[PDB]
Amino acid sequence: RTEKIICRDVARGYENVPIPCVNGVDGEPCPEDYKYISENCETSTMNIDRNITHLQHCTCVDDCSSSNCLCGQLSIRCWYDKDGRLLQEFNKIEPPLIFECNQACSCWRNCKNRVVQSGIKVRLQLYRTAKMGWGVRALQTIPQGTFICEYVGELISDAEADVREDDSYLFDLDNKEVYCIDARYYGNISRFINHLCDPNIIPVRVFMLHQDLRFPRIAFFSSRDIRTGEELGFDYGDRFWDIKSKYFTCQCGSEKCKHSAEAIALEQSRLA
Numbered sequence: 540r541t542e543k544i545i546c547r548d549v550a551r552g553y554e555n556v557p558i559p560c561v562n563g564v565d566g567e568p569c570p571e572d573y574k575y576i577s578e579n580c581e582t583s584t585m586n587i588d589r590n591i592t593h594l595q596h597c598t599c600v601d602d603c604s605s606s607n608c609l610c611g612q613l614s615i616r617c618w619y620d621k622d623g624r625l626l627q628e629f630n631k632i633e634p635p636l637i638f639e640c641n642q643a644c645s646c647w648r649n650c651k652n653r654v655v656q657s658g659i660k661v662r663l664q665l666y667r668t669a670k671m672g673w674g675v676r677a678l679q680t681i682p683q684g685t686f687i688c689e690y691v692g693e694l695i696s697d698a699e700a701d702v703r704e705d706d707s708y709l710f711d712l713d714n715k716e717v718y719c720i721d722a723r724y725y726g727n728i729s730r731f732i733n734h735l736c737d738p739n740i741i742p743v744r745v746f747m748l749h750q751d752l753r754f755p756r757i758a759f760f761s762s763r764d765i766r767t768g769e770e771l772g773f774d775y776g777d778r779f780w781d782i783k784s785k786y787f788t789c790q791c792g793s794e795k796c797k798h799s800a801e802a803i804a805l806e807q808s809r810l811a
């Protein structure tokens with residue numbers, strides 16, 4: 540059985556780079572049960588605050604690399620280095636909110652605080668995994684702290700999420716009324732990223748063209764150096780697995796697996 544290229548670009552030209560789809564495992568064609576979108580969509584009135592006068596913004600007359608950048612200060616500091624990668628000191632456990640520069644800033648569109656809004660730069664592939672359906676892998680080495688892709692989908696209310704049958708593609712935007720990104724019907728490449736118990740990417744809340752704090756955009760950055768061919772994955776969290784472990788178990792394969800049939804059996808036994 541050969542590896543076949545089934546789609547030259549699942550994004551249909553909407554990303555900076557093509558994202559091909561291949562299958563070397565089984566006879567499944569390229570997934571078509573969803574609509575690919577490169578940016579979040581709305582299917583109801585969300586009333587996002589898009590008032591330009593409500594934007595906090597910088598007065599920077601340089602490239603925004605000084606500690607005088609208001610946008611950086613909103614993030615404690617700008618966390619991007621000269622090549623757009625998170626600093627080694629970045630809090631990978633409890634990430635701060637990132638405020639990127641925006642249309643109200645005095646700075647230029649190429650300033651040092653515009654990583655997420657510049658879109659996908661790394662080379663990714665949608666591929667058929669052995670045991671986890673479709674997944675997303677790197678076609679190249681990716682240093683720690685590199686922006687990968689955004690978690691994109693349909694913005695829905697908590698109450699709408701509570702009525703959705705298929706909850707397998709939900710990303711929660713928790714706050715203190717709350718919202719979800721549902722990637723089931725409308726999503727980007729991130730909808731295909733599997734759970735790994737030892738993750739190589741972390742989600743980060745970012746603000747760009749608006750600063751309505753109810754609607755952070757979710758940016759995945761590598762949490763360590765990623766090798767060519769390595770499957771991308773993040774921790775779906777204990778909530779997902781509480782609901783789902785009764786239906787299927789984790790196939791991540793890691794010695795550190797917390798959600799496999801074996802690991803679940805050890806915990807059920809260790810309970811006695």
Ligand SMILES: COc1cc2c(NC3CCN(C)CC3)nc(N3CCCN(C)CC3)nc2cc1OCCCN(C)C
Binds near residue numbers: 700782
């Ligand atoms: C199965 O994984 C998740 C399920 C749900 C879920 N599920 C059900 C919807 C249909 N009803 C009948 C029962 C609940 N509801 C909600 N929310 C939003 C916040 C809390 N609200 C009070 C409840 C509505 N969030 C979820 C988040 C999930 O994983 C997120 C991480 C993994 N992603 C990245 C793949």
Ligand SMILES: Nc1ncnc2c1ncn2[C@@H]1O[C@H](CSCC[C@H](N)C(=O)O)[C@@H](O)[C@H]1O
Binds near residue numbers: 674708732
């Ligand atoms: N570690 C893991 N073990 C087993 N199945 C997983 C997994 N991570 C993700 N999945 C599967 O993928 C769903 C999340 S959506 C991720 C893409 C999915 N593999 C697909 O083919 O479309 C989960 O509900 C589960 O069905």
Ligand SMILES: [Cl-]
Binds near residue numbers: 545546547
């Ligand atoms: Cl094609």
Ligand SMILES: [Cl-]
Binds near residue numbers: 585586
């Ligand atoms: Cl409102």
Ligand SMILES: [Zn+2]
Binds near residue numbers: 598599602607611
């Ligand atoms: Zn600035």
Ligand SMILES: [Zn+2]
Binds near residue numbers: 602641644647650
């Ligand atoms: Zn700037």
Ligand SMILES: [Zn+2]
Binds near residue numbers: 597609610639644
């Ligand atoms: Zn700015």
Ligand SMILES: [Zn+2]
Binds near residue numbers: 736792796
């Ligand atoms: Zn696992």
